[PDB]
Amino acid sequence: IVCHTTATSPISAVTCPPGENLCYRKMWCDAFCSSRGKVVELGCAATCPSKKPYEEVTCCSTDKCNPHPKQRPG
Amino acid sequence: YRGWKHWVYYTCCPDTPY
């Protein structure tokens, strides 16, 4: 179960590895947010209790959860 | 003065491979 690198980028040398878990992705999204975000962050967690009212982090399991610069504005 | 800002926080303008 393998994330990409993160932030700016397509590539480097990857894996969230020994345990535990999930590619913990912060995404700003001001409200609304209509065409808004352009904010990654991520540096892995052990656990999924990020799920709350004014967050950002949601947990990021399964694969590469990783988007882009969201902005494919489209 | 200033130092300072900066953004954000954007994934804008990748990395690049090339």
UniProtKB/Swiss-Prot annotation, chain A:
Record function comment: Binds with high affinity to muscular (tested on Torpedo marmorata, Kd=0.4 nM) and neuronal (tested on chimeric alpha-7/CHRNA7, Kd=0.95 nM) nicotinic acetylcholine receptor (nAChR) and inhibits acetylcholine from binding to the receptor, thereby impairing neuromuscular and neuronal transmission. It also shows an activity on GABA(A) receptors. It antagonises GABA-activated currents with high potency when tested on primary hippocampal neurons.
Included range, full protein: 22 to 95 of 95
Keywords, sorted A to Z: Acetylcholine receptor inhibiting toxin, Disulfide bond, Ion channel impairing toxin, Neurotoxin, Postsynaptic neurotoxin, Secreted, Signal, Toxin
Organism listed in the record: Bungarus multicinctus
UniProt subcellular location: Secreted
Annotated family: Belongs to the three-finger toxin family. Long-chain subfamily. Type II alpha-neurotoxin sub-subfamily.
Disulfide bonding pattern of the chain: 3-23, 16-44, 29-33, 48-59, 60-65
Tissues where the protein occurs: Expressed by the venom gland.
Annotated Gene Ontology cellular component terms: extracellular region
Identification of the protein by name: Alpha-bungarotoxin
Quaternary organization: Monomer in solution, homodimer in crystal state.
Location, primary (coarse class): secreted
Other comment: Is identical to Alpha-bungarotoxin (A31) from B.candidus (AC Q7T3J2).
Any GO molecular function: acetylcholine receptor inhibitor activity
UniProtKB/Swiss-Prot annotation, chain B:
The organism's place on the tree of life at top rank: Eukaryota
Disulfide bridge map: 12-13
Annotated localization: Postsynaptic cell membrane; Cell membrane
Similarity annotation: Belongs to the ligand-gated ion channel (TC 1.A.9) family. Acetylcholine receptor (TC 1.A.9.1) subfamily. Alpha-1/CHRNA1 sub-subfamily.
Function per UniProt: Upon acetylcholine binding, the AChR responds by an extensive change in conformation that affects all subunits and leads to opening of an ion-conducting channel across the plasma membrane.
Subunit structure: Pentamer of two alpha chains, and one each of the beta, delta, and gamma chains.
Protein name: Acetylcholine receptor subunit alpha
Gene source species: Tetronarce californica (Pacific electric ray)
Gene this chain is encoded by: CHRNA1
Residues of the full protein shown: 205 to 222 of 461
